[PDB]
Design a protein around this nucleic acid. Structure first.
Length: 59
RNA sequence: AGCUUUGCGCAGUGGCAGUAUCGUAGCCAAUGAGGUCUAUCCGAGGCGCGAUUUGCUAAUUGAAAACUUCCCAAUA
């Protein structure tokens, strides 16, 4: 061994940069495994939730 | 001529909602169902059935919780 301490800290942060929740991370992993994404209503709900969260974070 | 009584039906408001609201279809019942007051007084409900139906929205779980295609790659 060369001799050092591992500087490893891995995570699952979405491509948008937001750190996916463990439930959200499991949902993303299951979507990737099943090869199927969110539906139209799911997309609308996600967009509304993201917009509300962004507006709350604004002020 | 203006108002108004039983008020009715429409629309708005307030409140109530398991004891209640109603059908009650089973039964008695304006040809009296019921009693400590009132008994030579009072006079229309009670026993049993079943629910409180119409829609919208958020969320919640799930891999997907639904409304007409889809994951992909250098560009335009």
């Amino acid at each position: 061994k060369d001799g050092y301490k591992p500087d490893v800290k891995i995570e699952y942060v979405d491509e948008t940069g937001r750190k996916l929740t463990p439930k959200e991370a499991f949902r993303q992993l299951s979507h990737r495994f099943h090869g199927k994404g969110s539906g139209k209503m799911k997309t609308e709900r996600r967009m509304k939730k993201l917009d509300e969260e962004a507006l709350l974070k604004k002020m």
